[PDB]
Amino acid sequence: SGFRKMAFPSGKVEGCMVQVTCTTLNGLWLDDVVYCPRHVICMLNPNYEDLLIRKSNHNFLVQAGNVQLRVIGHSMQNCVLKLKVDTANPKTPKYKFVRIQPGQTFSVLACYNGSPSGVYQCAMRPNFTIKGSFLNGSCGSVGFNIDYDCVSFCYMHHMELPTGVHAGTDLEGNFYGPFVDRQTAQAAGTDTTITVNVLAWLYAAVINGDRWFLNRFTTTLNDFNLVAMKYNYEPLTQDHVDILGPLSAQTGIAVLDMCASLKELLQNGMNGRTILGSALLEDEFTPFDVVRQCSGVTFQ
Amino acid sequence: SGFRKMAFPSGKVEGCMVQVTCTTLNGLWLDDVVYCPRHVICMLNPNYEDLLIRKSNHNFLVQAGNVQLRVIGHSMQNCVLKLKVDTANPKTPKYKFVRIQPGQTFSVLACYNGSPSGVYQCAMRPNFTIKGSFLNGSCGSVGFNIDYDCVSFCYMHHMELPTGVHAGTDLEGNFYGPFVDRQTAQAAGTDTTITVNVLAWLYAAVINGDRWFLNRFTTTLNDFNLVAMKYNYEPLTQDHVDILGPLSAQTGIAVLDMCASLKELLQNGMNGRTILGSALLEDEFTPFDVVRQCSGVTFQ
Ligand SMILES: *[C@H](O)[C@H](C[C@@H]1CCNC1=O)NC(=O)[C@H](CC1CCCCC1)NC(=O)[C@@H](NC(=O)OCc1ccccc1)[C@@H](C)OC(C)(C)C
Ligand SMILES: *[C@H](O)[C@H](C[C@@H]1CCNC1=O)NC(=O)[C@H](CC1CCCCC1)NC(=O)[C@@H](NC(=O)OCc1ccccc1)[C@@H](C)OC(C)(C)C
């Protein structure tokens, strides 16, 4: 028992990280292609089209530890640069490129100089930013889930916005949110709490023996949303009630009974008490994350 | 910028994990030896001495993915079993065996069936437990730090105590705390807050722009301890003031001024406000952890 913010093991992604110099940042070496942010080639308003067809293959140096990989092509796709290289990565995992939704979680492998430095669990926020830990040289760090032996790549790091929050692309080079890879003043809007994830984490607490917040009440979905939206929580949808069904059956607690417990917690506060050792209601675990951590792991 | 509970990248430890069956749990394959909990051979009060010299090498099966490693010797050291095998692990990292102190942090790679399932950051608690996430079959999961290219192994998982907290050994098979590998009623005592780590994390907050808790006051070490010990914080020692020196110089905030800010926070509470997005003062980052995350990572 116990519940922790757990990342995926990072070894499959570590063997894909390389350095790209044109600026220095990180690239993802899969098959015979290295993917990295196009901004490696720049700043207030660049035209990447020009700067790209203007480079040769010898104007990108790609380092896989000490080994120079020879660039034999360069293409752009959206905000991602693809460098074709002479050698297929012998440590290419089975992988997919996925675009995630706000509320979904993933692991970040933060890299510098093509070298892994740390791993942590993030969520795509409703305002399409992530609250990461990234410094100068982290661009090209990736986000991923593992499903069986399969790495699902969902995020590539491009920029920090004011207020210490992070923006980036899917691996097809498409930004999450309405941000652009230019050094004009952008800002993420006000964020929202991920209601479904908070309920998932209240179920994890009950599975782990932490029951004090349960009450004898029930609520309707509309009465629940009437309270939650006052505290800047996303409205709970029928589809969110449905994906909580498995955690509901496992625990014997109806989703709308857990809603009633969460309603009381928002209106009365915690009274200095904690849940799974937190004084705030956590929103960075999905229903799937709870089930993986509480049972799914034993089948590894 | 940004500050997250960051684990070390786990790839170097993933290539050392194997399954051991005699009971099934995890082993650590370094050089020609597999290390795992001796309790793999059991329950209320076993004598391991007997059960050990009573097994042959064919009574331990060691699986490295699909590959059977042949056992050619078995020795016991404290609460750890060492299985000598015919083959040196070709993915043995540069490594040390270290015993950590209460207050120090490490990464856990939680494994099932010899296969990695997740990574998270833990601290050795003053009561010599860890607050982990471990289920049936997790024994033999390890804790580690990385220093340069060098894995420092500090923890092997053996048991869960009541209240959902975890106990284990160093890699010489020596328990952290006064626990034994027998199924007699044991309990960890009341725990303590790691004062030095809370100050380290208040420095991380200031580095990351979160300044609202700073005040104009100072305190002596004795007046600070007089308050902190009322809130079940460890007394701050001169040695703890010394190891905060670098974070002090970087930020221009004197350690005893940060003590005065922490004093006010303990007596007045946060007023529902947060620091680095937490409503509790966090104690699971050391001074070193702060410096690694805020700058040290760029030199990877
Ligand atoms: C990749 O290594 C880095 C990662 C950054 C470094 C600091 N923290 C990170 O996550 N990426 C950058 O440094 C990028 C690079 C530019 C991106 C587009 C064009 C090519 C260069 N820059 C930033 O991330 C800046 N963000 C930004 O410019 O946002 C728009 C903006 C401009 C002016 C006012 C407000 C907003 C960062 C470095 O700037 C701030 C810290 C001021 C947000
Ligand atoms: C290794 O795979 C597992 C890991 C456990 C599984 C559940 N969570 C974990 O972290 N280890 C165990 O299952 C061990 C194995 C025994 C250890 C010593 C002798 C050989 C078998 N058992 C436990 O971890 C139990 N803890 C325990 O027995 O503590 C002493 C005790 C006894 C009676 C009352 C109070 C305390 C767990 C499974 O028991 C409790 C969950 C009741 C604490």
PDB file of N, CA, C and O in Angstrom, chain A residues 111-148:
ATOM      1  N   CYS A 111      16.205  16.566 -19.900  1.00  0.00           N
ATOM      2  CA  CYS A 111      17.569  16.386 -20.454  1.00  0.00           C
ATOM      3  C   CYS A 111      18.254  17.731 -20.714  1.00  0.00           C
ATOM      4  O   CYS A 111      17.566  18.773 -20.882  1.00  0.00           O
ATOM      5  N   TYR A 112      19.584  17.683 -20.633  1.00  0.00           N
ATOM      6  CA  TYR A 112      20.574  18.759 -20.924  1.00  0.00           C
ATOM      7  C   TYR A 112      21.722  18.089 -21.678  1.00  0.00           C
ATOM      8  O   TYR A 112      22.250  17.012 -21.194  1.00  0.00           O
ATOM      9  N   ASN A 113      22.120  18.705 -22.788  1.00  0.00           N
ATOM     10  CA  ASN A 113      23.317  18.302 -23.571  1.00  0.00           C
ATOM     11  C   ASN A 113      23.092  16.884 -24.137  1.00  0.00           C
ATOM     12  O   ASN A 113      24.059  16.109 -24.173  1.00  0.00           O
ATOM     13  N   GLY A 114      21.841  16.497 -24.419  1.00  0.00           N
ATOM     14  CA  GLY A 114      21.486  15.134 -24.847  1.00  0.00           C
ATOM     15  C   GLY A 114      21.578  14.094 -23.735  1.00  0.00           C
ATOM     16  O   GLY A 114      21.625  12.927 -24.074  1.00  0.00           O
ATOM     17  N   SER A 115      21.665  14.482 -22.460  1.00  0.00           N
ATOM     18  CA  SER A 115      21.894  13.552 -21.329  1.00  0.00           C
ATOM     19  C   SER A 115      20.759  13.648 -20.303  1.00  0.00           C
ATOM     20  O   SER A 115      20.475  14.713 -19.780  1.00  0.00           O
ATOM     21  N   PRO A 116      20.127  12.524 -19.917  1.00  0.00           N
ATOM     22  CA  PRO A 116      19.001  12.565 -18.959  1.00  0.00           C
ATOM     23  C   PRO A 116      19.395  13.082 -17.567  1.00  0.00           C
ATOM     24  O   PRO A 116      20.495  12.765 -17.004  1.00  0.00           O
ATOM     25  N   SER A 117      18.548  13.921 -16.979  1.00  0.00           N
ATOM     26  CA  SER A 117      18.906  14.462 -15.644  1.00  0.00           C
ATOM     27  C   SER A 117      17.854  14.181 -14.590  1.00  0.00           C
ATOM     28  O   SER A 117      18.248  14.052 -13.424  1.00  0.00           O
ATOM     29  N   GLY A 118      16.574  13.995 -14.970  1.00  0.00           N
ATOM     30  CA  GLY A 118      15.552  13.632 -13.999  1.00  0.00           C
ATOM     31  C   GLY A 118      14.214  13.326 -14.687  1.00  0.00           C
ATOM     32  O   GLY A 118      14.072  13.576 -15.857  1.00  0.00           O
ATOM     33  N   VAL A 119      13.352  12.681 -13.948  1.00  0.00           N
ATOM     34  CA  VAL A 119      12.059  12.174 -14.394  1.00  0.00           C
ATOM     35  C   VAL A 119      11.046  12.616 -13.371  1.00  0.00           C
ATOM     36  O   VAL A 119      11.271  12.543 -12.161  1.00  0.00           O
ATOM     37  N   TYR A 120       9.945  13.148 -13.866  1.00  0.00           N
ATOM     38  CA  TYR A 120       8.776  13.439 -13.014  1.00  0.00           C
ATOM     39  C   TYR A 120       7.495  13.359 -13.831  1.00  0.00           C
ATOM     40  O   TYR A 120       7.547  13.456 -15.044  1.00  0.00           O
ATOM     41  N   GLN A 121       6.401  13.219 -13.094  1.00  0.00           N
ATOM     42  CA  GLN A 121       5.013  13.068 -13.584  1.00  0.00           C
ATOM     43  C   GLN A 121       4.367  14.458 -13.723  1.00  0.00           C
ATOM     44  O   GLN A 121       4.519  15.313 -12.788  1.00  0.00           O
ATOM     45  N   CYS A 122       3.792  14.750 -14.911  1.00  0.00           N
ATOM     46  CA  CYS A 122       3.127  16.036 -15.261  1.00  0.00           C
ATOM     47  C   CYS A 122       1.672  15.771 -15.728  1.00  0.00           C
ATOM     48  O   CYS A 122       1.378  14.669 -16.283  1.00  0.00           O
ATOM     49  N   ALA A 123       0.838  16.806 -15.760  1.00  0.00           N
ATOM     50  CA  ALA A 123      -0.479  16.741 -16.440  1.00  0.00           C
ATOM     51  C   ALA A 123      -0.552  17.862 -17.449  1.00  0.00           C
ATOM     52  O   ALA A 123       0.000  18.948 -17.130  1.00  0.00           O
ATOM     53  N   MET A 124      -1.161  17.590 -18.613  1.00  0.00           N
ATOM     54  CA  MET A 124      -1.604  18.648 -19.527  1.00  0.00           C
ATOM     55  C   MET A 124      -2.713  19.434 -18.797  1.00  0.00           C
ATOM     56  O   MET A 124      -3.724  18.862 -18.426  1.00  0.00           O
ATOM     57  N   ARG A 125      -2.465  20.695 -18.502  1.00  0.00           N
ATOM     58  CA  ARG A 125      -3.415  21.535 -17.754  1.00  0.00           C
ATOM     59  C   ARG A 125      -4.518  21.950 -18.701  1.00  0.00           C
ATOM     60  O   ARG A 125      -4.332  22.012 -19.925  1.00  0.00           O
ATOM     61  N   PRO A 126      -5.719  22.209 -18.183  1.00  0.00           N
ATOM     62  CA  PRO A 126      -6.800  22.760 -19.033  1.00  0.00           C
ATOM     63  C   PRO A 126      -6.379  23.979 -19.858  1.00  0.00           C
ATOM     64  O   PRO A 126      -6.919  24.108 -20.942  1.00  0.00           O
ATOM     65  N   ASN A 127      -5.438  24.808 -19.416  1.00  0.00           N
ATOM     66  CA  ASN A 127      -4.930  25.944 -20.246  1.00  0.00           C
ATOM     67  C   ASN A 127      -3.791  25.514 -21.192  1.00  0.00           C
ATOM     68  O   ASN A 127      -3.073  26.428 -21.666  1.00  0.00           O
ATOM     69  N   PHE A 128      -3.569  24.209 -21.415  1.00  0.00           N
ATOM     70  CA  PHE A 128      -2.584  23.626 -22.384  1.00  0.00           C
ATOM     71  C   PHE A 128      -1.126  24.001 -22.066  1.00  0.00           C
ATOM     72  O   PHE A 128      -0.248  24.136 -22.962  1.00  0.00           O
ATOM     73  N   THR A 129      -0.831  24.204 -20.793  1.00  0.00           N
ATOM     74  CA  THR A 129       0.559  24.301 -20.300  1.00  0.00           C
ATOM     75  C   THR A 129       0.804  23.082 -19.415  1.00  0.00           C
ATOM     76  O   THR A 129      -0.182  22.377 -19.043  1.00  0.00           O
ATOM     77  N   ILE A 130       2.063  22.873 -19.099  1.00  0.00           N
ATOM     78  CA  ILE A 130       2.484  21.931 -18.032  1.00  0.00           C
ATOM     79  C   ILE A 130       3.246  22.700 -16.975  1.00  0.00           C
ATOM     80  O   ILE A 130       3.884  23.729 -17.261  1.00  0.00           O
ATOM     81  N   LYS A 131       3.099  22.262 -15.757  1.00  0.00           N
ATOM     82  CA  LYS A 131       3.908  22.845 -14.666  1.00  0.00           C
ATOM     83  C   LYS A 131       5.107  21.929 -14.505  1.00  0.00           C
ATOM     84  O   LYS A 131       5.040  20.945 -13.751  1.00  0.00           O
ATOM     85  N   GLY A 132       6.182  22.237 -15.218  1.00  0.00           N
ATOM     86  CA  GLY A 132       7.405  21.430 -15.169  1.00  0.00           C
ATOM     87  C   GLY A 132       8.533  22.025 -14.351  1.00  0.00           C
ATOM     88  O   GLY A 132       8.353  22.942 -13.551  1.00  0.00           O
ATOM     89  N   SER A 133       9.700  21.485 -14.595  1.00  0.00           N
ATOM     90  CA  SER A 133      10.979  21.995 -14.090  1.00  0.00           C
ATOM     91  C   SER A 133      11.915  21.987 -15.283  1.00  0.00           C
ATOM     92  O   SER A 133      12.392  20.896 -15.661  1.00  0.00           O
ATOM     93  N   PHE A 134      12.097  23.127 -15.906  1.00  0.00           N
ATOM     94  CA  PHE A 134      12.933  23.207 -17.110  1.00  0.00           C
ATOM     95  C   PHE A 134      13.795  24.479 -17.025  1.00  0.00           C
ATOM     96  O   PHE A 134      13.280  25.569 -16.666  1.00  0.00           O
ATOM     97  N   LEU A 135      15.066  24.313 -17.361  1.00  0.00           N
ATOM     98  CA  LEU A 135      16.053  25.399 -17.468  1.00  0.00           C
ATOM     99  C   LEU A 135      16.549  25.511 -18.918  1.00  0.00           C
ATOM    100  O   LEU A 135      16.124  24.689 -19.832  1.00  0.00           O
ATOM    101  N   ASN A 136      17.401  26.514 -19.138  1.00  0.00           N
ATOM    102  CA  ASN A 136      18.083  26.765 -20.430  1.00  0.00           C
ATOM    103  C   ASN A 136      18.727  25.446 -20.877  1.00  0.00           C
ATOM    104  O   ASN A 136      19.360  24.831 -20.037  1.00  0.00           O
ATOM    105  N   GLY A 137      18.499  25.005 -22.119  1.00  0.00           N
ATOM    106  CA  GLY A 137      19.087  23.771 -22.686  1.00  0.00           C
ATOM    107  C   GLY A 137      18.196  22.518 -22.563  1.00  0.00           C
ATOM    108  O   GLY A 137      18.601  21.432 -23.109  1.00  0.00           O
ATOM    109  N   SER A 138      17.035  22.649 -21.935  1.00  0.00           N
ATOM    110  CA  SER A 138      16.063  21.545 -21.752  1.00  0.00           C
ATOM    111  C   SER A 138      15.187  21.286 -22.962  1.00  0.00           C
ATOM    112  O   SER A 138      14.566  20.196 -23.006  1.00  0.00           O
ATOM    113  N   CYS A 139      15.083  22.234 -23.885  1.00  0.00           N
ATOM    114  CA  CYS A 139      14.232  22.064 -25.079  1.00  0.00           C
ATOM    115  C   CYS A 139      14.561  20.744 -25.747  1.00  0.00           C
ATOM    116  O   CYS A 139      15.754  20.416 -25.850  1.00  0.00           O
ATOM    117  N   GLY A 140      13.529  20.066 -26.228  1.00  0.00           N
ATOM    118  CA  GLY A 140      13.713  18.754 -26.857  1.00  0.00           C
ATOM    119  C   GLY A 140      13.541  17.615 -25.883  1.00  0.00           C
ATOM    120  O   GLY A 140      13.452  16.491 -26.366  1.00  0.00           O
ATOM    121  N   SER A 141      13.559  17.866 -24.564  1.00  0.00           N
ATOM    122  CA  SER A 141      13.072  16.925 -23.523  1.00  0.00           C
ATOM    123  C   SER A 141      11.670  16.468 -23.920  1.00  0.00           C
ATOM    124  O   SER A 141      10.912  17.264 -24.495  1.00  0.00           O
ATOM    125  N   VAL A 142      11.365  15.200 -23.658  1.00  0.00           N
ATOM    126  CA  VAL A 142      10.059  14.654 -24.071  1.00  0.00           C
ATOM    127  C   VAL A 142       9.247  14.174 -22.879  1.00  0.00           C
ATOM    128  O   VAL A 142       9.808  13.849 -21.788  1.00  0.00           O
ATOM    129  N   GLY A 143       7.940  14.103 -23.137  1.00  0.00           N
ATOM    130  CA  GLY A 143       6.905  13.507 -22.300  1.00  0.00           C
ATOM    131  C   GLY A 143       6.389  12.232 -22.948  1.00  0.00           C
ATOM    132  O   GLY A 143       6.227  12.193 -24.202  1.00  0.00           O
ATOM    133  N   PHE A 144       6.021  11.271 -22.144  1.00  0.00           N
ATOM    134  CA  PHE A 144       5.659   9.923 -22.620  1.00  0.00           C
ATOM    135  C   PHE A 144       4.832   9.172 -21.550  1.00  0.00           C
ATOM    136  O   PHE A 144       4.890   9.449 -20.317  1.00  0.00           O
ATOM    137  N   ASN A 145       4.049   8.219 -22.058  1.00  0.00           N
ATOM    138  CA  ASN A 145       3.464   7.096 -21.289  1.00  0.00           C
ATOM    139  C   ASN A 145       4.051   5.791 -21.831  1.00  0.00           C
ATOM    140  O   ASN A 145       4.534   5.769 -22.978  1.00  0.00           O
ATOM    141  N   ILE A 146       4.086   4.752 -20.994  1.00  0.00           N
ATOM    142  CA  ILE A 146       4.361   3.360 -21.424  1.00  0.00           C
ATOM    143  C   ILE A 146       3.088   2.532 -21.226  1.00  0.00           C
ATOM    144  O   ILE A 146       2.372   2.717 -20.235  1.00  0.00           O
ATOM    145  N   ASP A 147       2.767   1.747 -22.239  1.00  0.00           N
ATOM    146  CA  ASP A 147       1.566   0.879 -22.356  1.00  0.00           C
ATOM    147  C   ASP A 147       2.133  -0.424 -22.919  1.00  0.00           C
ATOM    148  O   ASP A 147       2.531  -0.452 -24.110  1.00  0.00           O
ATOM    149  N   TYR A 148       2.336  -1.402 -22.045  1.00  0.00           N
ATOM    150  CA  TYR A 148       2.856  -2.746 -22.386  1.00  0.00           C
ATOM    151  C   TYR A 148       4.370  -2.550 -22.553  1.00  0.00           C
ATOM    152  O   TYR A 148       5.020  -2.162 -21.554  1.00  0.00           O
TER     153      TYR A 148
END
